[PDB]
Amino acid sequence: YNYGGFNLEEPEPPCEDPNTVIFCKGRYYLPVSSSTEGDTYQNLRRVG
Amino acid sequence: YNYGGFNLEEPEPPCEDPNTVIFCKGRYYLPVSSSTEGDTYQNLRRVG
Amino acid sequence: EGPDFPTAQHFVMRFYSETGSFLDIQGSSVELNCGQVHNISVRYILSL
Amino acid sequence: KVQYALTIPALLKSGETQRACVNLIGYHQPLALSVVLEHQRVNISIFSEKVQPPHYFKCNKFMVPTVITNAPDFVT
Amino acid sequence: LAGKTIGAVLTDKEGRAEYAIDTSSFVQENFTVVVSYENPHQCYYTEW
Amino acid sequence: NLARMAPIPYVLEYLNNTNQLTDELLQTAVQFLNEGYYRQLRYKLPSGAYDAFWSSPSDGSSWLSAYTFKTFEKAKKYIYVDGKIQQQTLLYLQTSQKLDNGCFKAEGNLFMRQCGQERDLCFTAYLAIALLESNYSSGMTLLDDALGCLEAAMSSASTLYFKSYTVYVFTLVQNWEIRNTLLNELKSKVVSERGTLHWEREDKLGQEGIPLYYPNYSPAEVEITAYMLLSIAKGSDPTH
């Protein structure tokens, strides 16, 4: 999207706190992720 | 339950690992628990 | 100073989808001629 | 619930006919739509159609007015 | 509960206030609640 | 630094049109605006945003952002600046306009807020007036939705000095019937002083308290006087 050096991308939405705890079924649950993962955003932004 | 030098308590079951990662519906989650809580097991063992 | 037999490792990354429903193409190593309708194949899964 | 899909290149090419497409779905009743491009002076009317029950995905033509310079603008 | 005032309850003419605090949607772990009497009128004077 | 440097191009145009001026002052002005140019640009977000702090995920300060916008725009007529950066700045700021009925929403959290009492309509008009003086024509839908939100706010409510801003807003586009429609009240709020006439801000709220911190009496009445000056500086056709 940086075309002629023109950004054109939306800003990245706000983050989530890493400490709030969740329960659904078993023990208590804390979010975690990879830094680099694949989605529709990453499958696009290649075509653009 | 510890009466007259007699324990009568059965041993605790096996523990869980601190790194198994499970996803259910949204984010990606790790175990956590509090020692200081209450179960029916501690509900009993107070009466006898 | 290599291994004592032909060997090769591949490192790959995972995709993401919140509910789980998957799209892939059967990649083809072939050029497709003009004006000839072609029926390249796509596989999918879908979650409850 | 109504939902839609806007399909447009981010890099417009000057002076030639281009495509833009949309994928409305979810609605039931008739609706209206309006697709506009923001030229630095004028608006454009790529899609301004009435909508009749669901399952509308339509792709269409338009012409780019020439500009002497590369310029980011808006589509609505 | 934590820092937010929710009670604002009038007594039963003899100082026996009772309050029904919601417990749904709580996954909290410590939960030290506290109760207060705020009134800028009584003959009361900070001592210790 | 940006605040202190902003008035110099204006005193420069004052020096010119007043026709008392000298080349050494001109070139000193050029070099001062040169370090102004170079010095703050380096604190530009890749988004094109600008912020007093120095952390990229931190954002906002749209007021100072548009301030940069207009300041560099004014400097342009006396020295070259990139316009690509200007357009990316537009790109950053238009993110704040994603309101259909709400037109624009303001956000104020900095080391010194403005005389406004935090009503997004006011700073919306501020953004609009900064916009209008640009190097572009009416084909900026920012103009469109700005004027729409205006005409929505006009006949309904609002305070005096917002309306005052809207005065010059309509003067520059020369939508000269609402301009009189509101200039009547504008003029009516005059105050008579010694051989003089001017406007003094209404002081409904008393001395500063726990929430009241900035005594914006004199600067606000000054800005209102000046904006009235400009608006009446151009009647639609006539000036007698």
Q: Which residues from chain A sit within 8 angstroms of residue F59, using beta carbons? A: 11
Experimental method: cryo-EM
- Report the Cα F19 to chain-centroid distance in Å: 27
Decide: F220 and F115 in contact? Cβ < 8 Å.
Answer: yes
Name the β-bridge partners of D18.
Answer: D62
Q: Which of D41, D68, D69, D76 to mutate against chain F (most F CBs within 10 Å)?
A: D41
Nearest to F86 by CA among F62, F65, F110: F65
Kindly state whether D66 is in contact with chain A, defined as any CB-CB distance less than 8 angstroms. no
Phi, psi (rounded to 5 degrees) for F236: -60, -70
Rg for chain A, CA atoms, rounded: 16
Half-sphere exposure of F190 (CA within 13 A, CB side): 11
d(CA F161, CA F20): 34
Q: Sign of the C-alpha dihedral, residues D63, D67, D69, D71?
A: negative
Instruction: Give me the residue label for tokens 């900064």.
Output: F130
| Closest residue by Cα to residue B32 from A21, E30, A28 | A28
- Subunits next to A (3 or more Cβ pairs <8 Å) are B, C, D, E, F
Residue F78, phi then psi, degrees to nearest 5: -120, -5
Closest CA to B26 of A16, F210, F169, C31: A16
Q: Do the Cβ atoms of D13 and D54 come closer than 8 Å?
A: no
* Nearest CA among D75, D70, D71 for reference residue D19: D75
- Residues F168/F235, Cβ–Cβ less than 8 Å: no
Torsion of CA C15, C16, C20, C25, to 10 degrees: -30
Resolution, rounded to a tenth of an Å? 6.4
Distance CA F178, CA F170 (A): 7
- Judged by a CB distance cut-off of 8 A, whether residue E24 touches chain A is no
The one-letter amino acid code at E27 reads V
Q: Chain A contact for D9, CB < 8 A? A: yes
Token pair belonging to F16: 């010119």
8-state DSSP, E40: T
- Three-state secondary structure readout of chain F: CHHHHCHHHHHHHHHHHCCCCCHHHHHHHHHHHHHHHHHHHCCCCCCCCCCCCCCCCCCCCHHHHHHHHHHHHHHHCCCCCCCHHHHHHHHHHHHHHCCCCCCCCCCCCCCCCCCCCCCHHHHHHHHHHHHHCCCCCCCCHHHHHHHHHHHHHHCCCCCHHHHHHHHHHHHHHCCCCHHHHHHHHHHHCCEEECCEEECCCCCCCCCCCCCCCCCCHHHHHHHHHHHHHHHHHCCCCCCC
By a Cβ cutoff of 8 Å, what residues of chain A touch chain C?
34, 36-39
